[PDB]
User: Fold this.
Amino acid sequence: IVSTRTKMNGCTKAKQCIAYKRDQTKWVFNSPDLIRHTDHSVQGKLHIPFRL
Amino acid sequence: ENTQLSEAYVEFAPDCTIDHAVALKVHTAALKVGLRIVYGNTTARLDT
Ligand SMILES: *[C@@H]1O[C@H](CO)[C@@H](O)[C@H](O)[C@H]1NC(C)=O
Ligand SMILES: *[C@@H]1O[C@H](CO)[C@@H](O)[C@H](O)[C@H]1NC(C)=O
Assistant:
């Protein structure tokens, strides 16, 4: 965990290393193009406008 | 070591609420009849 800091790790290869610009602040509609967070929890809903 | 898992299911579409059809089992036809009967300028409306 690094905030406003550049940091290094033992394994010099920067490829296998992985970083997140994670914010985890907003809810989104389930879509195939987006990976599922480990929570996999139903947190809210929404309606669909312009019914029949 | 990477692995991917996908799953799929289905549900009735939101518009179904009005586009839905229903399967019916019917039997034992029964009749109801409405009659008008006049006797000596005495009219009567009945249903049976
Ligand atoms: C990162 O989050 C921690 C925990 O909320 C906080 O103490 C720290 O100040 C934050 N650093 C930032 C926002 O640069
Ligand atoms: C029906 O006819 C009789 C005679 O046949 C008469 O006395 C009576 O007033 C009539 N009734 C009506 C509702 O017209």
